[model samples]
Target chain A: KVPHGEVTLVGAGRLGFRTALNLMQIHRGGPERIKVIDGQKVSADDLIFRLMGAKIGEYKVKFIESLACDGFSRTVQGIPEYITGDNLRLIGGDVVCVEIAGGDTLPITTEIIRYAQERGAATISTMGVFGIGEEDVSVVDIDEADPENPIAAYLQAEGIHEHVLVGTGKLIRDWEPVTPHVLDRVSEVMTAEILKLLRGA
Target chain B: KVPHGEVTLVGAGRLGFRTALNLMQIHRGGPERIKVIDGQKVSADDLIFRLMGAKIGEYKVKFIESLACDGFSRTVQGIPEYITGDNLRLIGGDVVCVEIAGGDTLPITTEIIRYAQERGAATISTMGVFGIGEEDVSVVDIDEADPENPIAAYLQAEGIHEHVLVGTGKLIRDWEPVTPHVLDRVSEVMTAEILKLLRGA
Candidate 1:
């Protein structure tokens, strides 16, 4: 049983970034501890784009703060932070540590899990841990009839039901602001049962 | 003296198609023979795009009668007709009647000299079949501002620079377009240079 806290494990990539920001927003000043672990080097660009209260082009100076903080555990290549699972024993391991590893780090994930386990920390695989079937994940049907999605609607009216999306899931679906007409007129109707996606760390 | 004939090779790729088309225009209504020799199956989209004749989305196909025949020859693993040079004379003992070997169709290229020699046909490379950089065959730069260009004014304005062109001894300037914009734009420019390019091709 998770000790009175939540455990979130995230995988690095585009999706990993948004999920972290969302979690930070939801857990602001709440009675919860958040630990972020990722395989990528946490850079100024990531912070400016992610953390609010940052001005444009502020990423240049943000590196100073990063350098001051020893969050990066350079001992292990690609490991972002050494706090969460590394020091769980100090607090009796009653911590909810979120780990963000990459696809390449999968082979060494067991090593991370063992390290966490030694300190009584829980481990979870966010590398597609959500048992969504490949077909379900790949089922992208664009409906251009709502008159709101002008481009999509035009293609749809021409019988183009599906189009290749150039970018990743989060970039195309989330962060981008919808065109005013699309936001006002287009509607997305889900025909299948909807399962909430849980993105940890 | 070389016989005045043209050959049109189709559907090798974007550049190949355009080069063959350019060759056709140079020999238009002349005694030149135009043959569409292809190693790969023509893509319908490319075929339609090429044959549209009008400015569909972005470009115009200028010379129609330049290409004499709409036929294809499969350049397979080492055959003749597609194979040139010593091998051509080896197979048929006569360069003029020899065919390019199927497998060894002289890797996809715009180098007419290499292509000619590969078929054992006489070339400038073949001990004075042609002069060494003769002034009579001097490549003229039509545009004074752009001394390297053999194209028109407007086409070069479309981000088409002279350095992007690579010619094989006054043959087609060889370079792969990184984007479709560059490809189509350059093709449009090369249409006018077809007469000069085919002087070698």
Candidate 2:
């Protein structure tokens, strides 16, 4: 049986939004156990693949709240703010915190990954995705990723230490665009993996 | 030299944006020769990688306009709407149409591809990017993709016919997520190949 626990998603962009949707599909606790957070608003382009027309011009969390509540029988807490180092402690404890946000501001993406792990929370840090092609997507231990990978390089450059669960892809072409098909696939895998992690599988 | 002509990017997500950026980096005609059509708005998540923060809540075309103008000394025409079968002809002729949208709806992705080919426009249709986990992302003829590939199955199920410039990846895991590094690589290879195609090299 699926366990009952909370899942905190930071970012709510392509990776976070899709992963949340997948979680909702299989999660038994419904929206009540999910905490959706994002500091950004919705753009028109997001409608093509992720957001709906009704979600345009709204905060991502607000939009998610409507979708999650409308589709499920629970209420999800949507936080419309960015994650930062100073407030990382506010994420609570013993929950699974998925870090899929970008930017190097406070509690940087790498910082959040490290913070979550140290706090004994199951953590999955999704990296790369930008400028990635469909077939080049991947999920690997941070240590096992290509040494030349840009994210790996960024981690190294920033003095961020080792991390475990990581997602990545290849650079087949410098000009290729990402498709919704690819995003959907990435979310599919991440949802499965996250469920397994939640279950300690 | 990069040929002077028209380029149409069907979806303005990760792949389409990067491809257009690549085209701008090389093409001399600037944005006048390029038309980027996507009927969606930008989301906050895009700021994490593709679109800038200032572009949130705006049409993707608007964001592209800023980037195209600020960097390339050109302005790419951004269509703030989705593509459809009835309007596929509006894309004009003899251009490079890159289809990176999700599964077709009306202006079915496959139909756009078929229509583009019939009109003599060079086309590249990016396939799925989920659960893939190898460095083996590749560009192949549509017929060359593994029969077991999900995208392959999708095409067969949808009767989407065939495409020439197909991008795909190896499925090393049942679950995976795309990373920026992989995107960079795919874009790199895609840019090189698209340039080659544009130049008929």
Candidate 3:
């Protein structure tokens, strides 16, 4: 049997942060065994999503390590500076989580997805998390995702309809303020999927 | 307008921990303004739900402070070792969050709820957060809650149906093991309602 838990999350924003946090709580492997990859510096406005652990100027990846807390045997690692096709080796684990789509990083993100599948590993992608409207958050087949969602539309167009969608159901646009957490719901939904993959269930 | 962010959460288990974590993340008030009340010591078997920030024998209330991380102005408080009628005085702020129902402690718990409303404060209670079945978690009216769920039944029977229910839709018994984060989903839904009330929405 494979290891019951080993996860590498490619982005450390709202969805990524919550998934990793929830996963660490449930997975016995703990922090030194988990990896978070993000290269962006935290901004003031992003503080809401940063939670209580991060400093405004820190890298999102670096900030997440603090989330593991000092009581643990070891803290989480937050490097990988970037997720290039070659960096796929660095995103080691039986499962990888990504929160990007329809952007400059799309190709590398998709490559990361395929590599995981090729190696008998798993990858979970998130789309349509932005918005103020309440569409129940869910984890569904890519084919079941809403087409009007730009992120979902772009990924489906890229021929990646086989992967699942941990989504906010493609509701409103992103300009409005996202309160308390539509992000937490989407991420909690994503966390269950990640735990299933980690356990090989 | 009120200070817009002040919360006191009672019961520091799976649901309690996550709501405080999400609240600190989304609420601009930070840890200095938030309070967590619980008196149980952590157990090894409980690690799965404890997340990364707690030690095996530490008090669950104190274990939660590290979750606030070092970057914030001040961390959360874990005192008020117990909640009583006189001790309810210790559970202050504009909001009080409770996760206990139908227990021997039911009277004081309900008394805490009434005092909060009596003083123009808000109290949000939790129900049905156990088991493995998939119930789409939601924030619904007390009258809309399922009758079969013990926690919901206990609270509703107490004539405490005015407060909202952050629940797992009451589908099964609690003897089974709970997974990765049915707690996180219920708590995330609870977090949204807490945030709305925090924002005075």
Candidate 4:
């Protein structure tokens, strides 16, 4: 068995999912010991395929649907808490609240993150770079052509579509890739690098 | 401005959606000329945020939901003809179908792909890669350690509890890094590559 530390991954974005998949392969006990939390209801396709069968055991991945109206819904009546294994105990990694730009933010975002963090959970938020658009910028400056910078060009292109799509002037994509694997790697590498400095002292 | 053509991107998998977004940006005539198609309904998030406006026009990106039922409902409406502007018409590009792996292979699959292809439409099949089982045999040889895969490992480790939580196995880890811009480049590159190879030589 591996050591006793735990790393919690939030967000179910494309990169987020891929990182989880990679981590699941490396970590023993698979996703069962590691809890996955998400706020969005599963997509119709997701409903049919990934959610079926014995693959999802003891993992404690929570659904936004279950938390509908804060434990008041009849649907969650018999559902057990993900972490504590109790029906009444909602805790870290059992729930996640993601707030993308433009849409009205869900009420549970802060509390969910706080709950997980308070429980010695390592958190990675993909909040920095998501959707499209950014802080207020210029129009002509956005139109400039460049091939070398893909992310910038991509974001700018996404920004044009942002204006074109909803007529809403908000450019939403500002968050960076704080996704799980990369985030964890950064911390691990940084910690190791810092320890190397300690050796000199 | 670029030689005009209409391509229909089906399936909202990461590749398909990314391809559509990229195609819309790089090609000319705004998004009016480009057509987007999908078997799955666009996510409320996608409809409201991602593809809100811009070149998608009002009708350019034609979404055909419930195709998992072969558009039987639409056909019942007495408008079997799904290829006209009044009913279903193409506003641009040489028609292209990207990955038709939706619904089980219950006759509707062949009908949809064949029907679309008969209309001078270019069709591509990605159905070969859905729910790849351990002993699937078809692509079983494709990956050596698949049976020992983490998803499978999770199923073995925690049994049914994990399945109940995560639900569909496919939803577990389904995202990649190919950006919209990169996908557009791929379509262009593939077309040019094919064009050069098939230059009537």
Judged by DockQ cut-offs, the docking class of candidate 3 is incorrect
In model 4, what lDDT does residue A199 have? 30
Decreasing TM-score order of the candidates: 3, 2, 4, 1
> Candidate 2's residue-wise lDDT over B61-161, tens digit each?
55774564312433354555566665564354345556455554323766776777776776665554432335555776556766677656655555554
DockQ of 2: 0.01
lDDT of 3: 0.65
Please provide TM-scores, in order, for all candidate models, with all chains considered together. 0.22, 0.44, 0.44, 0.24
Taking chain B only, the TM-score of every model is 0.34, 0.77, 0.80, 0.38
Worst 10 residues of 1 chain B by lDDT: B72-81
What global local distance difference test value does model 1 have? 0.29
Query: Candidate 1 residues A85-154, lDDT tens each?
Result: 3332212122222223333443344444455555555433221212212212222334522334333344
lDDT of 4 at A70: 21
For candidate 1, what is the interface RMSD?
A: 32.9
Write model 3 residue lDDT over B1-201, tens digit each, in one string.
222445788887766877777776653443235677776667887764446756787777656755644344333655425577754545556678887532466677778777777767777886666656566777766677777766567767877745776776543454655564688788787877877676663
Give each prediction's DockQ, rounded to 2 decimals: 0.01, 0.01, 0.01, 0.01
Compared with the true structure, what per-residue lDDT tens digits does model 4 show for residues B1-201? 432333544444444544444444453332222334433333433543244432322222333211212212111000111222221222112344443333443243334434554554543322123233231212111122233444334323432110101111232245432234433443444333223222222
For model 3, what is the error of residue B156's alpha carbon versus the real structure, in angstroms, after optimal superposition? 3.9
The list of candidate 4 runs beyond 4 A from truth reads: A1-201, B27-32, B44-93, B127-201
lDDT, residue B150, candidate 1? 33
**How high is the lDDT of residue B24 in model 3?**
66
